[PDB]
Design a protein around this ligand. Structure first.
Ligand SMILES: N[C@H](CCC(=O)O)C(=O)O
Ligand SMILES: N[C@H](CCC(=O)O)C(=O)O
Ligand SMILES: N[C@H](CCC(=O)O)C(=O)O
Ligand SMILES: N[C@H](CCC(=O)O)C(=O)O
Ligand SMILES: N[C@H](CCC(=O)O)C(=O)O
Ligand SMILES: N[C@H](CCC(=O)O)C(=O)O
Lengths: 264, 264, 263, 264, 264, 263
């Protein structure tokens, strides 16, 4: 089990940051990244469809005999965590919403921004309230942010105006921190910080640390002496993928392969 | 054959305008609209994947024994028209790019805006040049427009600034007309007209008229006396679908059903 | 908390009447409707199946952090009210049977028509006799009514003949009122009236009024002045919008396909 | 292999007729019936849901090691036949639509009645036209029939009136035969014949004949001396289930066992 | 049914060994071989492409009315087995991975060599672990072997050196057997045994035995007096194809016919 | 027209060398690379198959309205140059065999190594003997080289032994130069040199220079001062970026999976 890869489970593109994080704390581990690039975005799809898609990716990863899964995507974590856990059986699953919650559960008043699917699922408020039901949670979807960022609008006047549209909801709420509850949003954190001067919470590294602690405590660390294998399995490769993905990864996606979920 | 439905073939959401158009010129015809809502957008996907998806929708429509197909989506028309035609066999296929070309092929200098997939496919320039190779064609993708419009940003300062970003390319080109080469773009035509004061070409109604002429000349008109049947078959129904779709349709999508392409 | 939605808990389709009522009497409340359209009808299924299904919907609604639940379906109310309440915990639950019973507690002879499951459960008679054992309660299931109505047979000779088959039972019972103990039956009240000349009790509005009272007493009224209406369903067949909107009497604002697989 | 059971795959209740037919045609075969009684009817559900459900049943049946399957339900046959066959790989699958089509492919004008789902799927017309594209097929849903029959309304004035409502569609069509394209409809064939007195085609018996032919010619017949075993697996045992089921089966179900499909 | 041919389904060239084995084990059976010689190798292609190709071949074979299929290729077996079985509905499909797994499920430590695609798919390890999750499986791709062998390098110093490069991975693994998980590798088994002298497992012969068992026990054996017919369908006849193919088949291909799969 | 891209037409992988060359000598030209990665290798396939495949790629490239085409692959150039030219019509086509031949036309004895298909076609000898019939041309296919190189055997004892098997043929032929008549072979030029001490002719740069000349003569040079590089391929297996980028010597900017099914 020790020398099996870690599965990084994404909807697509923004979860590459978890790969980056893992490479910084677990440099000897093999990683399989999965992105369902053919069917993104998930943030604007129904709960039934997000669950259907996540069951397929889960089965694909389990067939690769990963030793652990991290769900990098907040939208999949919000809506399909249990579907994924049920398929993974004895394979542990770490998720980014659990990570986010762990960073705010001593506050009194918390804001959350995320995809429409995530916010409409109510997952962040529910999970925060499982820790403490008296934490005040204010949530607002930021529907345009994902496409905006994928199209390269990552700073400047457009980004600032779209952010004002979505973040003005929080001005009278006296929040103590704002959860960046979508993988894409930390890219624009500097623009967010200009509009809403509060602590911004990015749960990706925390999620990676949770996976580190689990592997360490359970003695499931890779002890091979060969170069780690980083495999990027995706269901589409459109022309902009290399450039937008590597904006998140911060290094080359050197071993990239087109796969299909047709049999899953 | 006369009393079979017309198939309106979309990627999703914006092709509903063709249904509206058809209902205005062919009020006695049954219509089946197909939208692959589960996997939109197509505008940012690869050619291989767009072809794969379009073959599935084509097979679904042919199994419903439509008498004609109109491809409402510029992205599918650009990349998968031949795939669809091959599946349809003796069933005629009308497409929106053919319609657009028919509206500009006596000009000297033409601009085109469309999805990244459409513009990168080169389909509009190629098809215009098939009519006359000496027409000057200037093309620019407007990647953010589709999501922007689906998120409800349809006028105002954000729309104007995003449009300035994409349309400034045309200011020195002396174009005689600008093809609105995506179903979504006519929604924002007033904002476009503020930035680039040229004739805007919306090919949807022309495409519908092409289908009318074909049915009329071939004596394939519905002569039943019952209420026409309008069926909206979609592969997902997310929460925003009703409202955003009916913004394009301009009337209620009264008979709506979730379907699957898994067997296609 | 007062800006959280109300949850309308249905088996499917007929509970849209409760949404209509709440839109009227509580025009500034947000509402989440849940319909298990994939698995309807409930009215001809077993007790244990209805309980299993209802537990899943209850868990779904509690995950949404609704501020209150109204069980719009008589069948779920008859069979699974306790399970729903156990899942809802401190979230208040109003149900349509409690509403119906409240409208007859000054009478001495009452009839009840409902689904086969509701009648089999004997919930209406039990809940009435609990308040006053001397009230004579006569019950009769009307199995075909739900499908008949969903297929658009809502007046005319077919409806009258099916109704005569189920209602003739009441002619010699001297009832002072008939409880329409299924969401669907008020649609055909004109045909029912024709056959049985008695006061017809429709518990829908009273349930909605009880919910208003509960929100007022618990200080849970939304004070805002445009509400949002979400319709979460486990299936969307072609006929769903037409039939549903027949009960709702307006168009469904926002509709989404959801799954209970994880519940 | 030849001593494994035959699977009768139903939505619920009406498929028991095929069990009855196989008890007479193949008296030495073990039979497993499956009915998804918890979730019926299928006839009023979407294509996506019918396919989801049928995939779970098919997987349950394969796990019982059946040697052949007959899809007794027209609604599953119309919408999910390919899903079922793909799951039942090497196991042959006979369906009632194929049976029905085989009885009419010599005619010129054919009527079809079925559930809303079956008619909306266009499956009968499509499959007929695979054999002879020139046959005129007229199709009309009879939505109330399934519940009406299950509630015990099987003859008399109510049945005649409902039948008049649905069958009036055919009076001006000059059909040569009417396909009773739902398992339930043969129960009320005497009433149908009073209203529309044309040749009535019952797919269920022909499906049973096709299964015999498949087993006989392919040498898959059971010749053991152990008494045949009949098992009826259902997802619910509702109120009047035995009495309604025994209307179709015409004998008692000796082993009736509730199973859950939730693991599939 | 029993007089229909057996299909041998290959990527190309190496599968001819299975034809050779069936000529000896089942001398009275008609055989159709298919090799996609225009598009080989499959071993260095993506999962999505291997699945696309295998779906076309499978459809061609079903159209020849075969009664059973053996997937001779480990690469197709690893990646596209479910695709093939779903297309070959009722037709039973034997695969070489299943055969290989059946020969090692009594051991504790197993090595596997195969094409890059086969190893990257994890199929051998996964399938072994379905039977016994505690077996230690060590897998290494031998990418150059297929071309090397096809170019006629089948013994000698070059073969020994390349083999040393690939098999050095196993020297410290204490494996009890090595699965020769590619059709080509048994050709160089004497060289492999010089370098890594452990029990060598050849899936191809075991697959042929499993097919005999299936036909014998299921009564699908051909007993006609007409001479067996052998057909070899290929998508190309390249330069030295007969000479290379005859290395594996060990007799001449009497009917070798180019077909196109483009319609599938 | 001068802002249209150049098309680099490959079978797959090795033609990336031509992209590298053009990035160097034409730094402001946009480039579309096409590789039929799904169906490689071409070098061991039949003449008719190579022609069928090449016609599809040619049609794809013409649909993109490239301003010129360079056939980077010796195998396509040997077998399908006429088909590509017939499809390209007024779009100029440069090919690597014409380039290779141009570099030897002052010699009298020449060797050529290439794929089995290229050598079988006899294209190099035919095109050389056409210019001067007196030049002695000796040809030998090197079938294993393409796979060997793509699998990363690019130096050392294995490469030397395979090379000795194919090149020993030339020891007694008194050649003045050897044409490396396959895109892949320059990768192992150090091992080739070891065995055969003769001038090695790599036609890649000369083909790229001929394209420059053609663009200059036809007034088709892009005058702009950041170019865009698109890599269109029919498959992307795991090893593709590593092996491709070995030939390209930089990272592929923009990569897209495409299909020739409609071509
Ligand atoms: N990849 C984004 C979702 C990312 C997230 O929610 O963290 C999408 O598919 O919409
Ligand atoms: N529906 C849009 C494309 C519409 C069009 O190109 O006309 C999308 O999927 O991106
Ligand atoms: N929706 C009806 C029951 C409604 C009611 O009992 O109030 C059903 O599922 O049978
Ligand atoms: N059992 C019926 C369908 C039977 C059939 O279509 O043959 C239902 O579930 O609606
Ligand atoms: N024919 C080989 C694969 C053979 C096998 O994996 O068994 C290829 O195409 O790469
Ligand atoms: N790409 C090589 C041929 C390269 C060349 O001949 O220049 C192949 O497909 O075999």
């Amino acid at each position: 089990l020790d020398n099996r890869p870690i599965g990084v489970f994404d909807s697509g593109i923004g979860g590459l940051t978890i790969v980056k994080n893992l490479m910084s704390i677990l440099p000897n581990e093999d990683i399989i990244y999965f992105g369902d690039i053919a069917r993104i975005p998930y943030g604007t799809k129904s709960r039934a469809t997000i669950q259907k898609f996540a069951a397929q990716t889960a089965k694909f990863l389990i067939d690769q005999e990963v030793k652990a899964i991290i769900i990098a995507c907040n939208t999949i974590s919000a809506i399909a965590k249990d579907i994924v856990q049920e398929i993974a059986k004895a394979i542990p699953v770490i998720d980014v919403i659990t990570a986010g919650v762990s960073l705010v559960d001593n506050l009194n008043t918390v804001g959350v921004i995320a995809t429409p699917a995530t916010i409409n699922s109510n997952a962040y408020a529910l999970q925060i309230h499982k820790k403490n039901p008296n934490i005040e949670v204010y949530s607002n979807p930021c529907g345009l942010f994902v496409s905006m960022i994928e199209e390269g609008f990552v700073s400047g006047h457009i980004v600032e105006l779209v952010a004002k549209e979505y973040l003005s909801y929080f001005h009278d709420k006296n929040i103590q921190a704002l959860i960046l509850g979508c993988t894409h949003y930390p890219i624009i954190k500097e623009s967010i910080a200009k509009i809403l001067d509060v602590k911004l919470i990015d749960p990706s590294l925390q999620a990676s640390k949770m996976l580190y602690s689990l592997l360490f405590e359970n003695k499931l660390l890779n002890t091979t002496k060969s170069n780690p294998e980083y495999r990027f399995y995706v269901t589409d490769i459109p022309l902009k993928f290399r450039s937008v993905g590597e904006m998140f990864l911060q290094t080359e996606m050197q071993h990239l392969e087109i796969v299909s979920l047709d049999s899953y």
